[PDB]
């Protein structure tokens, strides 16, 4: 059982987009103050996924990479590769050299 | 803030933590079952103790949320399931005594060895030493000796233990706001809070009697026919007017009559539908058996088995060096892990068992979307009934012809259908009066209707009245004849077989009506019908989230258990038995006319 992977199961409000919450403060589900102790109505927010090889396909670990592309007023520098068509000389051709 | 949100967070942490502890306990049990080694036993015991302690702590913490301030039906159902004390309401000394009594009954039943006086050098255990003698012998005094000696040893050991057991279980049940332990068992079918679909604990006994009153003519005719055939087999022991002798029913206790098919066959000259030789000729492996079962389930529209099912199941006996339990069991380990533990041979019985256990796996897969504490059947009957319907459908000659296991030029005449229906009646109909009489006797024992000094005098009186089975010699109160069976000695409910039997044919009629089958009910196959699979899967996906009455409305369109599909299934056989019983006398007399 791999218990190095954790998830938040409880929070007072929903997350905003692209927000990270790494707080380990005890979740207060009741009127009573938690006081740092996981007693009645006060749970620990982060729970672990016990990833084991014999799990089902809907419970197996999946690595997710989300790529976020934004265009801002600054000069755009992450560009895609541009191919180089084999140079032809001594003929009337349409040339595109560095724009 | 509110109580309902607190309960929802509690049942959101509970489901995940319990799912993890469950998976670990179930995996330890699996590793014990496929590999009987002492470290696996220790790991199983540690996981079980952790699981039980965790269930005790969550039961202690769940009761602090009052039920009447929660309106959501699913949350109230999970909280009702969790808030049961179980044995925790009883004192620690009495709880320890009850656990000790249950464990020692388990050891007495499992390691009980009985053999003939004056020849004690070797003895035979119940499985398979006594089972084979009861199922295959034709000798009157040998079966009488085995039956009386095993009930003498087991009953004389278990009678004070059972007398303590009834008092402790009644004390726990009255401590849990129940009338008796019988009411505690009947509370599984209790539905409360749903308008129109409410079911009471007291309604179950009335419904069982109402169904059994319609069972009784068919069972009387079957009993008369079996009585005539056993009179042919044993000339002088069986009376024309009396009950059947107890040790002649083909099994140790009378649970099934399926071992009397050889003696009571209508048409021996006609062939059987045995397909074992065809699989031997075509070299069918157990993997091919499970692939054909998977093909059957994809034909009706249900999902196919996962890759982890094929990778992680043990479908063949491992070998001499590694020991495993031979009993076929479907395991829903949790987290989408589904396995079958079966030592599959090339037989028809193993093929039907593979269909039955894959039906169990399909039922387990269907409610995987549900929360952890609602991942069960709506009652104890549905879970077995959905496997028994697969056992019914797979056993049909149309299914065998469709998969190529039966010759396409096999003549399906009335005589083979009559003898097949008689075999299915001996297996299915014959267990119903025994099940009903045993459960009614246990309910009267728990309720206090029968005093301890009059347990057996009533019991045989019930058996003559209901089952039509007479004792060979009278038994006094030093015997404990019921507790020789596995379920009663190890604290298991027995009405699940009765409910399973009725739900089986109700589901069979519903799916055959959905599949538009136009012939006899026993000639019906539910393969290739997407709509029948959809009608099944609508109930299958619910699990324990909805009442069993609403699930039965979803399948058959009725709000209550019904007996008419069973009688419709055996109607050709019922007419044949009525024709064959013209000379003989249907019904029995409770007097001592055969033997006492
Ligand atoms: C069964 O247990 C034995 C005990 O040593 C072990 O060697 C073997 O690998 C186990 N087999 C399986 C299939 O788990
Ligand atoms: C009951 O709770 C479940 C989640 O726990 C929720 O999805 C469902 O909608 C609730 N039912 C009602 C009627 O509010
Ligand atoms: C469980 O037992 C406790 C005390 O032993 C009791 O207060 C509680 O009401 C019981 N719960 C139920 C459902 O009977
Ligand atoms: C189950 O069915 C799906 C779709 O028909 C298929 O892709 C998958 O391979 C099947 N699973 C197995 C184990 O064959
Ligand atoms: C089966 O059918 C044949 C012809 O219809 C008939 O002669 C025979 O008596 C029937 N047998 C039974 C048991 O119905
Ligand atoms: C059901 O479908 C399978 C797959 O196409 C087919 O082989 C089988 O013959 C069908 N059943 C019947 C009764 O035709």
Short mmCIF file of N, CA and C in Angstrom, two decimals, chain B residues 32-133:
data_model
loop_
_atom_site.label_atom_id
_atom_site.label_comp_id
_atom_site.label_asym_id
_atom_site.label_seq_id
_atom_site.Cartn_x
_atom_site.Cartn_y
_atom_site.Cartn_z
N UNK B 32 -5.52 -16.07 2.81
CA UNK B 32 -5.70 -17.28 3.61
C UNK B 32 -6.39 -18.37 2.81
N UNK B 33 -7.43 -18.01 2.05
CA UNK B 33 -8.23 -19.00 1.34
C UNK B 33 -7.46 -19.65 0.19
N UNK B 34 -6.67 -18.87 -0.55
CA UNK B 34 -5.89 -19.46 -1.64
C UNK B 34 -4.57 -20.04 -1.17
N UNK B 35 -4.15 -19.75 0.07
CA UNK B 35 -2.87 -20.21 0.60
C UNK B 35 -3.06 -20.43 2.10
N UNK B 36 -3.34 -21.67 2.49
CA UNK B 36 -3.57 -21.98 3.90
C UNK B 36 -2.20 -22.15 4.55
N UNK B 37 -1.71 -21.07 5.15
CA UNK B 37 -0.44 -21.06 5.87
C UNK B 37 -0.66 -20.26 7.15
N UNK B 38 0.14 -20.56 8.18
CA UNK B 38 -0.08 -20.00 9.52
C UNK B 38 0.09 -18.48 9.56
N UNK B 39 1.04 -17.92 8.79
CA UNK B 39 1.16 -16.47 8.73
C UNK B 39 -0.05 -15.82 8.07
N UNK B 40 -0.65 -16.49 7.08
CA UNK B 40 -1.89 -15.98 6.49
C UNK B 40 -3.04 -16.03 7.49
N UNK B 41 -3.07 -17.05 8.35
CA UNK B 41 -4.07 -17.13 9.41
C UNK B 41 -3.88 -15.98 10.40
N UNK B 42 -2.62 -15.69 10.76
CA UNK B 42 -2.34 -14.61 11.69
C UNK B 42 -2.70 -13.25 11.09
N UNK B 43 -2.39 -13.06 9.80
CA UNK B 43 -2.73 -11.81 9.12
C UNK B 43 -4.24 -11.65 9.01
N UNK B 44 -4.96 -12.75 8.74
CA UNK B 44 -6.41 -12.71 8.69
C UNK B 44 -7.00 -12.34 10.04
N UNK B 45 -6.46 -12.92 11.12
CA UNK B 45 -6.98 -12.63 12.46
C UNK B 45 -6.70 -11.19 12.86
N UNK B 46 -5.51 -10.68 12.52
CA UNK B 46 -5.16 -9.29 12.83
C UNK B 46 -6.06 -8.32 12.06
N UNK B 47 -6.26 -8.59 10.76
CA UNK B 47 -7.12 -7.74 9.94
C UNK B 47 -8.57 -7.79 10.41
N UNK B 48 -9.04 -8.98 10.79
CA UNK B 48 -10.40 -9.10 11.30
C UNK B 48 -10.60 -8.38 12.62
N UNK B 49 -9.60 -8.46 13.52
CA UNK B 49 -9.69 -7.74 14.79
C UNK B 49 -9.67 -6.23 14.58
N UNK B 50 -8.82 -5.75 13.66
CA UNK B 50 -8.80 -4.32 13.34
C UNK B 50 -10.11 -3.86 12.72
N UNK B 51 -10.67 -4.68 11.81
CA UNK B 51 -11.94 -4.37 11.17
C UNK B 51 -13.08 -4.32 12.18
N UNK B 52 -13.12 -5.30 13.10
CA UNK B 52 -14.18 -5.35 14.10
C UNK B 52 -14.06 -4.21 15.11
N UNK B 53 -12.82 -3.89 15.53
CA UNK B 53 -12.61 -2.77 16.45
C UNK B 53 -12.98 -1.44 15.79
N UNK B 54 -12.67 -1.30 14.50
CA UNK B 54 -13.02 -0.09 13.77
C UNK B 54 -14.53 0.04 13.62
N UNK B 55 -15.22 -1.08 13.37
CA UNK B 55 -16.68 -1.06 13.28
C UNK B 55 -17.31 -0.74 14.62
N UNK B 56 -16.70 -1.23 15.71
CA UNK B 56 -17.17 -0.91 17.05
C UNK B 56 -17.01 0.58 17.36
N UNK B 57 -15.86 1.16 17.00
CA UNK B 57 -15.62 2.58 17.26
C UNK B 57 -16.53 3.47 16.43
N UNK B 58 -16.76 3.12 15.16
CA UNK B 58 -17.67 3.92 14.35
C UNK B 58 -19.13 3.71 14.76
N UNK B 59 -19.49 2.52 15.25
CA UNK B 59 -20.82 2.34 15.80
C UNK B 59 -21.01 3.17 17.06
N UNK B 60 -19.96 3.26 17.90
CA UNK B 60 -20.00 4.10 19.09
C UNK B 60 -20.14 5.57 18.72
N UNK B 61 -19.51 5.99 17.62
CA UNK B 61 -19.54 7.40 17.23
C UNK B 61 -20.76 7.76 16.39
N UNK B 62 -21.41 6.78 15.76
CA UNK B 62 -22.52 7.07 14.86
C UNK B 62 -23.82 7.33 15.61
N UNK B 63 -23.95 6.78 16.82
CA UNK B 63 -25.20 6.88 17.58
C UNK B 63 -25.45 8.29 18.10
N UNK B 64 -24.41 9.13 18.17
CA UNK B 64 -24.53 10.49 18.67
C UNK B 64 -25.25 11.42 17.69
N UNK B 65 -25.58 10.94 16.49
CA UNK B 65 -26.35 11.70 15.52
C UNK B 65 -27.77 11.14 15.51
N UNK B 66 -28.76 11.87 16.05
CA UNK B 66 -30.12 11.33 16.14
C UNK B 66 -30.77 11.13 14.78
N UNK B 67 -31.55 10.05 14.68
CA UNK B 67 -32.13 9.65 13.40
C UNK B 67 -33.25 10.58 12.94
N UNK B 68 -34.05 11.10 13.88
CA UNK B 68 -35.25 11.85 13.51
C UNK B 68 -34.97 13.24 12.94
N UNK B 69 -33.73 13.74 13.00
CA UNK B 69 -33.40 15.03 12.40
C UNK B 69 -32.77 14.89 11.02
N UNK B 70 -32.84 13.70 10.42
CA UNK B 70 -32.29 13.45 9.09
C UNK B 70 -33.43 13.02 8.18
N UNK B 71 -33.55 13.70 7.04
CA UNK B 71 -34.66 13.48 6.11
C UNK B 71 -34.24 12.74 4.85
N UNK B 72 -32.96 12.75 4.50
CA UNK B 72 -32.49 12.09 3.30
C UNK B 72 -32.50 10.58 3.53
N UNK B 73 -33.12 9.85 2.60
CA UNK B 73 -33.37 8.42 2.79
C UNK B 73 -32.08 7.60 2.79
N UNK B 74 -31.12 7.95 1.92
CA UNK B 74 -29.87 7.19 1.85
C UNK B 74 -29.03 7.39 3.10
N UNK B 75 -28.95 8.64 3.59
CA UNK B 75 -28.17 8.95 4.78
C UNK B 75 -28.79 8.28 6.00
N UNK B 76 -30.12 8.29 6.08
CA UNK B 76 -30.82 7.63 7.18
C UNK B 76 -30.63 6.12 7.12
N UNK B 77 -30.59 5.54 5.90
CA UNK B 77 -30.36 4.11 5.76
C UNK B 77 -28.96 3.71 6.22
N UNK B 78 -27.94 4.48 5.82
CA UNK B 78 -26.58 4.19 6.27
C UNK B 78 -26.42 4.38 7.77
N UNK B 79 -27.04 5.43 8.33
CA UNK B 79 -26.95 5.65 9.77
C UNK B 79 -27.70 4.57 10.54
N UNK B 80 -28.83 4.09 10.00
CA UNK B 80 -29.56 2.99 10.63
C UNK B 80 -28.75 1.71 10.61
N UNK B 81 -28.04 1.45 9.50
CA UNK B 81 -27.20 0.27 9.41
C UNK B 81 -26.02 0.35 10.37
N UNK B 82 -25.42 1.53 10.50
CA UNK B 82 -24.25 1.70 11.36
C UNK B 82 -24.59 1.74 12.85
N UNK B 83 -25.75 2.27 13.23
CA UNK B 83 -26.06 2.51 14.65
C UNK B 83 -26.49 1.25 15.40
N UNK B 84 -26.53 0.10 14.74
CA UNK B 84 -26.83 -1.16 15.42
C UNK B 84 -25.72 -1.51 16.40
N UNK B 85 -26.09 -1.78 17.65
CA UNK B 85 -25.11 -2.17 18.66
C UNK B 85 -24.49 -3.52 18.33
N UNK B 86 -25.28 -4.46 17.82
CA UNK B 86 -24.81 -5.83 17.71
C UNK B 86 -24.65 -6.40 19.10
N UNK B 87 -23.51 -7.05 19.34
CA UNK B 87 -23.26 -7.64 20.65
C UNK B 87 -22.74 -6.63 21.67
N UNK B 88 -22.46 -5.39 21.24
CA UNK B 88 -21.86 -4.39 22.11
C UNK B 88 -22.80 -3.96 23.24
N UNK B 89 -24.12 -4.07 23.04
CA UNK B 89 -25.07 -3.67 24.07
C UNK B 89 -25.04 -4.63 25.25
N UNK B 90 -24.62 -5.87 25.02
CA UNK B 90 -24.55 -6.89 26.05
C UNK B 90 -23.30 -6.66 26.91
N UNK B 91 -23.33 -7.19 28.13
CA UNK B 91 -22.20 -7.06 29.03
C UNK B 91 -20.99 -7.82 28.49
N UNK B 92 -19.80 -7.40 28.92
CA UNK B 92 -18.55 -7.95 28.39
C UNK B 92 -18.38 -9.42 28.73
N UNK B 93 -18.80 -9.83 29.93
CA UNK B 93 -18.73 -11.24 30.31
C UNK B 93 -19.67 -12.08 29.45
N UNK B 94 -20.91 -11.61 29.27
CA UNK B 94 -21.87 -12.36 28.47
C UNK B 94 -21.52 -12.33 26.98
N UNK B 95 -20.97 -11.20 26.50
CA UNK B 95 -20.52 -11.14 25.11
C UNK B 95 -19.36 -12.10 24.87
N UNK B 96 -18.43 -12.18 25.83
CA UNK B 96 -17.32 -13.11 25.72
C UNK B 96 -17.80 -14.55 25.77
N UNK B 97 -18.80 -14.82 26.62
CA UNK B 97 -19.38 -16.16 26.71
C UNK B 97 -20.09 -16.54 25.41
N UNK B 98 -20.81 -15.58 24.80
CA UNK B 98 -21.48 -15.83 23.53
C UNK B 98 -20.48 -16.10 22.42
N UNK B 99 -19.39 -15.32 22.37
CA UNK B 99 -18.36 -15.52 21.36
C UNK B 99 -17.67 -16.87 21.55
N UNK B 100 -17.43 -17.25 22.81
CA UNK B 100 -16.81 -18.53 23.12
C UNK B 100 -17.73 -19.68 22.71
N UNK B 101 -19.04 -19.52 22.95
CA UNK B 101 -20.02 -20.54 22.58
C UNK B 101 -20.08 -20.70 21.07
N UNK B 102 -20.06 -19.58 20.33
CA UNK B 102 -20.08 -19.64 18.87
C UNK B 102 -18.82 -20.31 18.33
N UNK B 103 -17.65 -19.97 18.89
CA UNK B 103 -16.40 -20.57 18.44
C UNK B 103 -16.35 -22.06 18.75
N UNK B 104 -16.81 -22.47 19.94
CA UNK B 104 -16.76 -23.89 20.29
C UNK B 104 -17.78 -24.68 19.48
N UNK B 105 -18.93 -24.08 19.12
CA UNK B 105 -19.86 -24.75 18.22
C UNK B 105 -19.24 -24.92 16.83
N UNK B 106 -18.50 -23.91 16.37
CA UNK B 106 -17.80 -24.01 15.09
C UNK B 106 -16.76 -25.13 15.11
N UNK B 107 -16.00 -25.25 16.20
CA UNK B 107 -15.02 -26.33 16.31
C UNK B 107 -15.68 -27.70 16.41
N UNK B 108 -16.80 -27.79 17.15
CA UNK B 108 -17.50 -29.07 17.30
C UNK B 108 -18.09 -29.52 15.96
N UNK B 109 -18.67 -28.59 15.20
CA UNK B 109 -19.23 -28.94 13.90
C UNK B 109 -18.13 -29.27 12.89
N UNK B 110 -17.05 -28.48 12.87
CA UNK B 110 -16.00 -28.68 11.87
C UNK B 110 -15.20 -29.95 12.13
N UNK B 111 -14.89 -30.24 13.40
CA UNK B 111 -14.03 -31.36 13.76
C UNK B 111 -14.82 -32.51 14.39
N UNK B 112 -16.11 -32.61 14.08
CA UNK B 112 -16.91 -33.69 14.61
C UNK B 112 -16.76 -34.99 13.85
N UNK B 113 -16.24 -36.02 14.52
CA UNK B 113 -15.95 -37.30 13.89
C UNK B 113 -16.69 -38.42 14.63
N UNK B 114 -17.48 -39.19 13.88
CA UNK B 114 -18.35 -40.22 14.44
C UNK B 114 -18.13 -41.50 13.63
N UNK B 115 -17.94 -42.63 14.32
CA UNK B 115 -17.89 -43.92 13.64
C UNK B 115 -18.53 -44.99 14.53
N UNK B 116 -18.61 -46.19 13.97
CA UNK B 116 -19.39 -47.29 14.55
C UNK B 116 -18.78 -47.76 15.87
N UNK B 117 -19.59 -47.97 16.91
CA UNK B 117 -19.10 -48.63 18.13
C UNK B 117 -18.60 -50.04 17.85
N UNK B 118 -17.52 -50.41 18.55
CA UNK B 118 -16.71 -51.63 18.54
C UNK B 118 -15.71 -51.63 17.39
N UNK B 119 -15.73 -50.65 16.49
CA UNK B 119 -14.73 -50.52 15.43
C UNK B 119 -14.22 -49.08 15.40
N UNK B 120 -13.44 -48.68 16.41
CA UNK B 120 -13.03 -47.27 16.52
C UNK B 120 -11.65 -46.93 15.96
N UNK B 121 -10.99 -47.85 15.24
CA UNK B 121 -9.62 -47.62 14.79
C UNK B 121 -9.53 -46.49 13.77
N UNK B 122 -10.56 -46.29 12.95
CA UNK B 122 -10.63 -45.12 12.09
C UNK B 122 -12.06 -44.62 12.06
N UNK B 123 -12.23 -43.32 11.87
CA UNK B 123 -13.54 -42.70 11.85
C UNK B 123 -13.63 -41.74 10.67
N UNK B 124 -14.86 -41.40 10.32
CA UNK B 124 -15.17 -40.59 9.15
C UNK B 124 -15.75 -39.25 9.60
N UNK B 125 -15.27 -38.17 9.00
CA UNK B 125 -15.82 -36.85 9.24
C UNK B 125 -17.05 -36.63 8.37
N UNK B 126 -17.76 -35.53 8.63
CA UNK B 126 -19.01 -35.24 7.93
C UNK B 126 -18.78 -35.05 6.43
N UNK B 127 -17.85 -34.17 6.07
CA UNK B 127 -17.47 -34.02 4.68
C UNK B 127 -16.09 -34.62 4.46
N UNK B 128 -15.92 -35.51 3.47
CA UNK B 128 -16.95 -36.14 2.64
C UNK B 128 -17.33 -37.54 3.13
N UNK B 129 -16.88 -37.91 4.34
CA UNK B 129 -17.06 -39.28 4.81
C UNK B 129 -18.52 -39.67 5.00
N UNK B 130 -19.31 -38.79 5.63
CA UNK B 130 -20.71 -39.11 5.89
C UNK B 130 -21.63 -38.64 4.77
N UNK B 131 -21.21 -37.59 4.05
CA UNK B 131 -22.00 -37.07 2.94
C UNK B 131 -22.14 -38.11 1.83
N UNK B 132 -21.05 -38.82 1.52
CA UNK B 132 -21.08 -39.80 0.44
C UNK B 132 -21.94 -41.00 0.82
N UNK B 133 -21.88 -41.41 2.09
CA UNK B 133 -22.73 -42.50 2.59
C UNK B 133 -24.20 -42.10 2.52
#
